[PDB]
Design a protein around this ligand. Structure first.
Ligand SMILES: O=C(O)c1ccc(NCc2ccccc2)cc1
Length: 291
């Protein structure tokens, strides 16, 4: 799977909010482009002169994520975050010249991402009470991955002592994205666990945090809530469910070719961190069938 790389796999079956530190610093920002940020302004002006209803929005930037030594007490992850925007994304990661920017960043900074906006996404492996994961079909009208299968998620917008508020907004944002798109009540959702971070090599390496969330509703009840919103309540064009039993071998199915890279990242991390049992009971052959 060349279009997805794992940056981080979390220990312990996934990390809760209380175990993560963030450092939000202008040191973690994109570097100014070699010939100046005028090239970003030119792309933005061209776009607004065709679609004048578009608007910019701020985004968090992922610089790096360092895990503590496994089995240690205290905070287990440090996220190094900067600030970026939708405009900077369109002028860098989504530019036809994104590969040239990656080569220049390796040359100038020893960092293939130094000249890239790299907005941080969030996605969820969302499990039902009857042990299915939730999938969404993307519209054929969207710019990126039209018509492909996705999981719930989005790109959170800004508003350890500014740190703890930023981690809170990341965890809150994945629940809000589930409530807004799947039309579920907030009180049917568990607090998220962070599974890891995946990079989308088709979008010049921008990263998504991938979370596990459990819902107290069955697959039939989740379907009713999603559909009872009507066509204007969701950006997706359909919902469907796969048994967690069957998620284990999803990369061997015809579905795998239809999944967008950030959804591939969510499913690889679900299989490595929530699946893949380590103990004698769940690891026994009748419960973990060979092949
Ligand atoms: O060309 C566009 O307008 C365009 C719009 C979304 C898009 N993808 C989703 C997205 C990525 C990063 C930040 C926010 C959203 C790609 C391209």
């Amino acid at each position: 799977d060349p279009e997805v790389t794992l940056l981080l796999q979390c220990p312990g079956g996934g990390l809760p909010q209380e175990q993560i530190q963030a450092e939000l610093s202008p040191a973690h920002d994109r570097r100014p482009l070699p010939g100046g940020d005028e090239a970003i302004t030119a792309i933005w002006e061209t776009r607004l002169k065709a679609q004048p209803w578009l608007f910019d929005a701020p985004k968090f930037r992922l610089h790096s994520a360092t895990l503590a030594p496994i089995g240690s007490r205290g905070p287990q992850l440090l996220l190094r975050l900067g600030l970026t925007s939708y405009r900077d994304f369109l002028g860098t990661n989504w530019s036809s010249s994104a590969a040239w920017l990656r080569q220049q960043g390796a040359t100038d900074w020893g960092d293939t991402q130094a000249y890239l906006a790299d907005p941080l996404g969030v996605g969820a492996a969302l499990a039902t009470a009857d042990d299915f994961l939730v999938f969404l079909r993307r519209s054929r009208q969207v710019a990126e991955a039209p018509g492909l299968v996705d999981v719930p998620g989005g790109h959170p917008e800004p508003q350890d002592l500014a740190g703890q508020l930023v981690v809170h907004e990341l965890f809150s944002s994945v629940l809000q994205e589930i409530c807004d798109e799947v039309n579920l009540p907030l009180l049917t959702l568990s607090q998220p666990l962070l599974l890891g971070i995946a990079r989308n090599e088709t979008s010049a390496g921008r990263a998504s945090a991938e979370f596990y969330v459990q819902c107290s509703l069955t697959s039939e009840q989740v379907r009713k809530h999603y559909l009872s919103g009507g066509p204007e309540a969701h950006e997706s064009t359909g919902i469907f469910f796969v048994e967690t039993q069957n998620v284990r071998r999803l990369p061997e199915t015809e579905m795998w070719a239809e999944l967008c890279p950030s959804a591939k990242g969510a499913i690889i991390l679900y299989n490595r961190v929530q699946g893949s049992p380590t103990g004698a009971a769940l690891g026994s052959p009748a419960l973990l069938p060979p092949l």
